[PDB]
């Protein structure tokens, strides 16, 4: 036939025959930055002192920052009530839904206000015929 194909194939390398893509790493420009290393830190619950109700030991590690920096920077979580329920020792999975669902949904409107069915006067009841007091 003609010349060598794949120069390192009797010796330690592979192949090196085809080109391939890359990972980008963090300062070339093909890289999607990861959430959990461009928010702030503080914007975070975790907190990484070692030893508060909120540290990253005490919560699931390095696996549980990551997913919570992308309900952070998305938007998707606020990072006051978070926390406040993380120091009460709620494990991630059920502390997340607990700040959620506060301000999530409500009418917030106080019994008295709300009407009744005797507010108004039935069909051949009253006697008034001029509606007011």
Same mark, same amino acid.
């Given at each position: ?10 010796? *330690?390398? @592979? ?11 963090? @300062?070339?420009?093909? $890289? ?27 919560? *699931?590690?390095? =696996? ?13 979580? =606020? ?5 406040? @329920? ?19 949904? @409500?009418?917030?409107?106080?019994? $008295?206000? =709300? ?8 069909? *051949?009841?009253?006697?008034?015929? $001029?509606?007011?007091?």
């Amino acid at each position: 036939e003609d010349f060598l194909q794949t120069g390192p194939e009797r010796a *330690g390398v @592979g192949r090196q025959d085809k080109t391939v893509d890359a990972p980008p790493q963090f @300062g070339e420009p093909g $890289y999607v930055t990861p959430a959990y290393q461009r928010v702030k830190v503080s914007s975070l619950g975790i907190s990484v002192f070692e030893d508060d109700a909120n540290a990253v030991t005490k919560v *699931g590690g390095i =696996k549980a920052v990551m997913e919570v920096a992308e309900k952070v920077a998305s938007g998707e979580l =606020k990072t006051e009530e978070f926390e406040e @329920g993380l120091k009460a020792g709620l494990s991630l999975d059920l502390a997340l839904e607990k700040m959620e669902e506060e301000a999530a949904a @409500g009418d917030l409107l106080p019994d $008295y206000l =709300k009407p009744l069915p005797e507010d108004t006067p039935r069909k *051949g009841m009253t006697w008034k015929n $001029y509606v007011g007091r």
